[PDB]
Paper text:
CLC-2 is a voltage-gated chloride channel that contributes to electrical excitability and ion homeostasis in many different tissues. Among the nine mammalian CLC homologs, CLC-2 is uniquely activated by hyperpolarization, rather than depolarization, of the plasma membrane. The TM region of CLC-2 displays a typical CLC family symmetric homodimeric structure, with each subunit containing an independent Cl− pathway. All eukaryotic CLCs contain a pair of ‘cystathionine β-synthase’ (CBS) domains in their intracellular C-terminal domain (CTD).
We determined the structure of CLC-2 in complex with AK-42. The overall density for CLC2-TM-AK42 is very similar to that observed in apo CLC-2, but with an extra density that fits very well to the AK-42 molecule. Located at the extracellular side of Cl− pathway, the bound AK-42 appears to directly block Cl− permeation. In the binding site, AK-42’s phenyl ring nestles into a hydrophobic pocket lined by F306, F463, F459, M460, and L524. The carboxyl group of AK-42 forms hydrogen bonds with the side chain of S392 and backbone of K394. A third hydrogen bond – between K204 and the pyridine nitrogen of AK-42 – also contributes to AK-42’s stability in the binding pocket. The exception is residue M460, which moves ~3 Å to avoid a clash with AK-42’s phenyl ring. Notably, density corresponding to the N-terminal hairpin structure is not seen in the AK-42-bound structure. Intriguingly, the lack of density for the hairpin peptide in the AK-42-bound structure suggests that hairpin and AK-42 binding may be mutually exclusive.
Residue numbers in the entry:
A (entry chain B): 88 to 409, 419 to 485, 490 to 566
B (entry chain A): 88 to 297, 304 to 409, 419 to 485, 490 to 566
Write the structure that this text describes.
């Protein structure tokens, strides 16, 4: 069957495209730190370099995107949910939109702005499906139909999320929850088949490389295997779920409220529609200025990238017991204050930064806010019970995994975040805690606000089935 | 909200029912061992006790089923697939059918017979859902909607498979793949909710009155990239074997229909078929006789716990059962595989409440362990500081053959929750995908094959 040649080529090309983008994003983030370490000659020369380099990468991302393909701003998922519902869009799967996203996303993330890649990876995979089916001319000529287009793009959304999180089953399951309302079991088998082939290519690349480029071997946790938690502390993992449900409902509300204000302020909007590159540059300058380590970044671990922040929050050691915890315990504050200020600052910075005219997603931004809030509860438990909830003392890094999944699930309207965190953290010992928090987060988030992508659909005035 | 009160109570009742049944099955299997070791002075009395005890339990299970509810016979997935397509079955969700499935399955599994409970748990959970939805005051001709009822029967399949395997996510994904053609996202959220409340009650009971198959392999370099062809061969060979099982089951049912004089002779004296097949299996399972050459002294749980063992056996514990003084590990695994294959295809046809997942999962574990131990014999120092892990190949082969028989891929998710580890994920998915690609090209699912055999409303 020709469809099983299509799905191995769709799985091969998205693994290469993901690995090439990740190599280019890392080189951009490393150059910021090298430049800072070089320019320790004066605080003003170090500050000038810290604010300038992000603003140059974001200004180039917005300008280059506007020149090739103005359709390439924002996330794929809220359009793909309408393309699979049978609605044609103007230029969306064309090679100019591919070139615009692969270059424009690499500059948006390499700036060090608080931005995700999931929605963009769903669009880039769908463009690989479309452009593949024409480069080898499988489409049009031989009994081809809109049904076969929708069936090949649905497996591409599954490969898109699967390559993003390095989570081959949880990516297939997440794609179904966000793009669809009924899914064929035959389409879940085709997603699972192509996702498994993308996973195989990542192991070959990682074996040919020095390491997994996904730090700590794809965020692999190293907690104890025996008595990792007690039934006496299930009431704490439940309060993470509920609070993450309210938190994710506020994030989606605030992001829509920001866009509605920029549309309602018509005089400023007319000025900015002439001055098209001004708004993305000013937002980048503000965020980089507050993240400046010698000024205010010391109270937010501002010197860390988004990988480095999450690798630190998932450590097996306890911080409140009297390697990178040093970024959370500066000479002027304790770890609890630094967690509370990081949570409060990253919340408004991430609801704002995702509105700017660049290719960007939003899942890693809410995943790290959730991990920090989970770690705040975990260290607070380890401080209240210093030697046992007897003999088995508390493990705060396992509370961070539960908070990550619970806030990401509330914002997304999803339960496959539970499956992703097992494949990602490399362990299953916290399964019951994760599933209680994730279902409590969804039970109250779905009672308060739509999903993030359903807000983006209604903001963009795409055709909506509630 | 009435839907969450229902999905809490359904998660509580199926977990309580599952626990009381596993207590009663373990008691019946302990009685067999006590009675056997109490007779170690007389081989003849020990053989008489060994074949009589299971023949009595099966004869009672068949007889008690045929008195209360003949519709309670066999695996309940094919009828639930048919009822979820909107076909009506007469008395298939009633209290007589429940009592017959609960007691009949307890007696059928409390015996050495190669039977499972996956299909019976899908039926028992659907009876709990019917009884709860009949009990609650929102029952009546204004609100007994077929949509409401079909929505809860779809969640009850997920609770039943979740309680069966003790795999709360994998049990929802398997229920979708076997009972449905469209994965509705709103019902996959209900399956996850109700499977969570059962997993909580299971741990509360595991404190106050005390998955079970948890493994302890390396976290560092458990397999090399040089080994993926051996996990692929397991998937390919597991595709042909999983197709052969569905064919062999159907041929056995067609032959007992075909031969008219034998058919009518047995149908007049209905208990002679389940009694005489139990007697032949028990006679071959008798340990001082032939049974030592197929580990006949272990139960199904005790067998599977030895197959997932973290040591290599071919280096040259209950796992000694695979190496009697007269035969090695390999010969005992090959004899086990071939004898269990025909015994399980046959035993799942007999007139008692029985499923078929554990019998195929165990043959896959022995076939996987056989390939793992072959690799560990061929590569004594690694494919170095790192040696091969044969118990990981047993997890791969067990996941692949259960997927090829059932036409599912979510046996990959089940195996990580059972084993408590996710390090073998790439090997498992490659073996499962090869096993389904090879099997779907040859035969229907075991459950579709039963729909054809039973002349139910098929839909390819
Ligand atoms: O931060 C860095 O140093 C970095 C370096 C190289 C490449 N990417 C980096 N970061 C990054 C960002 Cl900004 C957004 C998304 C993301 O996707 C995977 C993922 C994994 C788990 C949860 C949620 C998303 C990654 Cl890995
Ligand atoms: O054998 C015993 O000593 C035993 C004692 C008490 C209760 N059950 C026992 N066995 C058993 C049987 Cl017969 C059928 C099904 C099953 O579980 C579902 C499952 C679990 C893992 C893999 C694949 C299926 C179990 Cl655990
Ligand atoms: Cl992301
Ligand atoms: Cl079973």
């Amino acid at each position: 069957g020709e469809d099983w040649i299509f799905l191995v080529l769709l799985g091969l090309l998205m693994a290469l495209v993901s690995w090439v983008m990740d190599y280019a994003i890392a080189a951009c983030l490393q150059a910021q730190q090298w430049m800072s370490r070089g320019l320790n000659t004066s605080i003003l020369l170090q500050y000038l370099a810290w604010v300038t380099y992000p603003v140059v990468l974001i200004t180039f991302s917005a300008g280059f995107t506007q020149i090739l393909a103005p359709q390439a701003v924002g996330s794929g998922i809220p359009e793909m949910k309408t393309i699979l519902r049978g609605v044609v869009l103007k230029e969306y799967l064309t090679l100019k939109t591919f070139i615009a996203k692969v270059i424009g996303l690499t500059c948006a993330l390499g700036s060090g702005m608080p931005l995700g890649k999931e929605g963009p990876f769903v669009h880039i995979a769908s463009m690989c499906a479309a452009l593949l089916s024409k480069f080898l001319s499988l489409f049009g000529g031989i009994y081809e139909n809109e049904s076969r287009n929708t069936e090949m793009l649905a497996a591409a959304c599954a490969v898109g999320v699967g390559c993003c999180f390095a989570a081959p089953i949880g990516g297939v399951l997440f794609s179904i929850e966000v793009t669809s309302t009924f899914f064929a079991v035959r389409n879940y088998w085709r997603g699972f088949f192509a996702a498994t082939f993308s996973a195989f290519i990542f192991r070959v690349l990682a074996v040919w490389n020095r390491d997994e480029e996904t730090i700590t071997a794809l965020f692999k946790t190293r907690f104890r295997l025996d008595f990792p938690f007690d039934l006496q502390e299930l009431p704490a993992f439940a309060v993470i779920g509920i609070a993450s449900g309210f938190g994710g409902a506020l994030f989606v509300y605030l992001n829509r409220k920001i866009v509605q204000v920029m549309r309602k302020q018509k005089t400023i909007n007319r000025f900015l529609m002439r001055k098209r590159l001004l708004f993305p540059a000013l937002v980048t300058l503000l965020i980089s200025t507050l993240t400046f380590p010698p000024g205010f970044g010391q109270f937010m671990a501002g010197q860390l990238s988004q990988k480095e922040t999450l690798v630190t929050l998932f450590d097996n050691r306890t911080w409140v017991r009297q390697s990178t915890s040093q970024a959370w315990n500066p000479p002027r504050a304790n770890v609890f204050l630094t967690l509370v200020i990081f949570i409060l600052m990253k919340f408004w910075m991430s609801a704002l930064a995702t509105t700017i005219p660049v290719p960007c997603g939003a899942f890693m931004p809410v995943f790290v806010i959730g991990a920090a809030f989970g770690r705040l509860v975990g260290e607070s438990m380890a401080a209240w019970f210093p030697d046992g909830i007897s003999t088995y003392r508390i493990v705060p890094g396992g509370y961070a995994v539960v908070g990550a999944a619970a806030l990401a699930g509330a914002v997304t309207h999803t339960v496959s975040t539970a499956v992703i965190v097992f494949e990602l953290t490399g362990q299953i010992a916290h399964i019951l805690p994760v599933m209680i928090a994730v279902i409590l987060a969804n039970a109250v988030a779905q009672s308060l606000q739509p999903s993030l992508y359903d807000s983006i659909i209604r903001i963009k005035k795409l055709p909506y089935l509630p």
